[PDB]
Structures are given as C-alpha cells and as structure tokens.
C-alpha cells in the first residue's frame, strides 16, 4: 500500500494523542477503569504500529496531584510497554541540556545508559498538571525523573519566553519540535501582544526543517483574551498539534491566511457531557517525510461511548401542544423512545467491539421553550439505572 511505501528509514511515525486525563472519575464504580484501559489501548496501539515515538498533548494526569493508584498504574503500564528492545532509529541534534534543564539528568531518556527505552514518550505539561508549588514541580516531573517520560517545552523565564526546539533527525528527514507548556490564556495573549514570544530556528538547512509545533490552549474564543487566535502564529510553522480542546477534529486542516495546518486530536476520554465530546474519539498517527506530512486517524475501541441529542419541543407543534394537559406524558414517551433508539445504536456499534464498555453515556438536551414544563428526571432515569453510565444525567433541560 501507499502507507507501507511511505514507511521507510527516512519516515517518522509519530503517534499523537492528548488529554488522557488519566484517573478521571477513578473513584467511580462503573467508569473507574475507563482512563486506565484507554491508556492501555493507546500504548498497545503505539507498540503494534512500531511508532518511532509518542507525542502527548498534555493533561496526562487528570488531577494536578495524581493519586497513588493512578501513578502506580501509569508507571507500570509505561514500564510494561515503552520499555523494550526495538531499536530507535532517530537521533538528537539539539542541546539536550537546554531542552531539559530543569531535570538533573539532562538528556533524552533513551540516551540514558541505564534504561532500556524502546518507545520514548514526549509530552508537554497541560493546564491541569502545570508545575506548581514553590518548587514548581508536576507529575510529568515525577515520571521524567523516574526515567520514563521526556518532559520538554518548559519555560525558564516568565518575563520573556524563548521556545527552543528539539531537533530530531531520522535519515534524510529532520524535525523541529516546538512545544509550549500550558500557560494561562490571558497572560500568554498579553505576552504575544507585547512581542514577548520568540521562536528560535536552526541556522543550518533552514528550509529543511519540518517545523512541528504543539500547544495546550483554548482554540475557541470564550472572552476578549480568554483564548489564543491562530493569527498570532507564523506561517513557517508547518504543523500544529492543538491539544487542549477535547473535541476531536484530528483531520489536518489548512489555514489559508497562515498557510499552516492545525490538528485537534481531542480528548481520549469524555470528561464532560457537551456536544464536542460526542464526536467519536480518535488518536492520530502522524507520518513525516521531508517537508510533507500525513495524518491517519485510528479509532479507540475502549473509549466509553457518548451519544447526545438536542430536541426542541417548539419545533414539533404537531407532536407537542403546550395547552394539551397530557403534553408532559407525550414528552416522556418521545424521550423514552429516543433514548431507546440511542441505546439500540450503541449496542449495534458495540456488537463488533468486544473491549468496548457495555454501558454507554447518554444525555438528552431538551429545549422546553414555548411553555413546556420539565418533568422528574430522577423518576424517568429510574428505568435505565442498569443501562447507562450516567443514570443521574440522562436528560438536560435548558432554555
């Protein structure tokens, strides 16, 4: 196939994922293992595809201080899979000490003489797990010091930021990885306004560096400076891994104004019941050869399914009549039918996937505008306690 030919000694095979939010709802009885099993699946896919390395978009741990079980499970999984014997066929040309200065072992993990790294893990600290405390440490620091994850993209200075790259070379192909750890949106917006953000580029073979950038910042505009416009970034950046946005648009998209592509891998777990969360989760395998690139999205078979539907009562005057005394009963009947259809679709999809969780997540958003009255969500949900993972959140009323 074309992909097989594209897989050569000069082709990078970068696996891309983000917002694992490991340990999310760990204490939950039903969803407890969702994050762990998803991490298992993603790492297993990384191993099977024989990926050159992993590039996680951040938020690796859901909590800023990961709980003991979470850390133990993550560490055992990493040791089980990413430690191995398969050769690594790419080399570092940058000043490692500069990239990983905050670590007392300033060199890439697989270059450690004492650890048998097979699948190096690169990441950038996300908002939920940014360095904190007077010491300014984070969970990724724990893993890195342990010698599993190469934590890069740290910001030495708050007044000014010099985003240095790590130069990865595999055969005739070269990559400049520019990572910018999660920073509060207002502050980073202001720094960009004040021309306080600078990106170093290699003077050597300037045009021969596929400039790969990663960031963990809001993509949509929720405020005057409560986001990051794409217009800020420059056109020399080839590909951008926008990570923080949980909704998935993994397909690369070209910015005509800026002439660079933007990829939004999205979350690996449905942290919230929002329309963006509903899109099927995926993890991107990025291939880089010369100045070109290609992204292939891979489905996850363990991500617990989320189905959402928005129903507007006022758009069904024939079905719903507010003057009708029994309008509430008809509303309940139609909602029940819709939820039955959603569960039918969920089971149909699950039939082909053994590992998939049995109880999917469902939320019905009801616009009761026009005088329609919400009914007892609890009593209605009583009937699906054993069918769905959010029995207390099956419906949502809003106006």
């Amino acid at each position: 196939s074309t992909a097989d030919a594209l897989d050569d000694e000069n082709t990078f095979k970068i696996l891309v994922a983000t917002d694992i939010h490991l340990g999310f709802m760990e204490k939950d009885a039903v969803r407890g293992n969702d994050t762990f099993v998803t991490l298992d699946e993603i790492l297993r896919l990384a191993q099977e595809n024989e990926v050159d390395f992993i590039l996680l978009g951040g938020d690796l741990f859901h909590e800023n201080k990961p709980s003991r079980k979470t850390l133990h499970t993550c560490l055992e999984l990493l040791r089980k899979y990413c430690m191995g014997d398969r050769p690594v066929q790419f080399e570092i040309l940058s000043d490692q000490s500069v990239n990983f200065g905050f670590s007392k072992f300033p060199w890439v993990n697989y270059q450690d003489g004492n650890l048998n790294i097979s699948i190096p893990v690169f990441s950038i600290h996300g908002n939920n797990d940014d360095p904190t405390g007077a010491d300014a440490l984070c969970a990724l620091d724990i893993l890195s010091c342990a010698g599993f994850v190469n934590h890069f993209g740290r910001s030495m200075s708050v007044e000014k930021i010099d985003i240095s790259p790590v130069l990865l070379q595999k055969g005739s192909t070269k990559i400049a990885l520019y990572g910018l750890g999660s920073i509060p949106d207002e502050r980073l917006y202001r720094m960009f306004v004040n021309k306080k953000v600078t990106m170093l580029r290699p003077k050597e073979d300037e045009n021969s560096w596929f400039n790969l950038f990663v960031i963990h910042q809001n993509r949509s505009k929720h405020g005057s400076t409560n986001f990051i416009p794409e217009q800020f970034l420059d056109d020399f950046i080839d590909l951008v891994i926008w990570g923080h946005e949980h909704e998935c648009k993994i397909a690369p998209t070209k910015n005509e104004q800026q002439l660079f592509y933007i990829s939004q891998p999205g979350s690996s777990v449905v942290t919230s019941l929002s329309p963006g969360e509903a899109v099927k989760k995926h993890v991107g395998l990025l291939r880089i050869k010369g100045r070109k690139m290609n992204m292939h999205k891979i489905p996850l078979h363990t991500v617990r399914q989320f189905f959402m539907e928005d129903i507007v009562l006022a758009n069904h005057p024939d079905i719903f009549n507010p003057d009708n005394p029994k309008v509430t009963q008809a509303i309940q009947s139609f909602c029940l039918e819709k939820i039955e259809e959603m569960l039918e679709n969920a089971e149909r999809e699950r039939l082909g996937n053994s590992h998939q969780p049995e109880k999917p997540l469902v939320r019905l958003r009801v616009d009761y505008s026009g005088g329609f009255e919400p009914f007892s969500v609890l009593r209605f949900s009583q009937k699906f306690v054993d069918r769905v993972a959010n029995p207390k959140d099956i419906i949502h009323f809003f106006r």
Partner: protein
Amino acid sequence: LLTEFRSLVIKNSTSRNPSGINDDYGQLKNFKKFKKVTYPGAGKLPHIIGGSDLIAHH
C-alpha cells in the same frame, strides 16, 4: 517566515559521534546506550526452592 535564527546543531570543536549497535540490517541505525548486565545464573535454569521445598518450622 524569517525569525530568530540560532546555530543549534550541537557540533563542538569535534562534532558529536552518534552511538550505534551491531548492524542487524545494512548499517543498523540505533542510538541507544542501554546494555543489561549479567548476573549469576544468567542463561541457566533457575534452582528455585519453593512449594514443598519449604517446611513450616515446628
């Protein structure tokens, strides 16, 4: 396109020599530096003392 350019290729008065491993295919490209060291009994069937081999002290 043009931005701050800095010579980043790490080449000292003597350029860095990449690491390698025994060439499995052609000239194998490996840059790892891990070699697990031997311990006594390596490659030998373990002389395990367990199960019935142990006796409760009375």
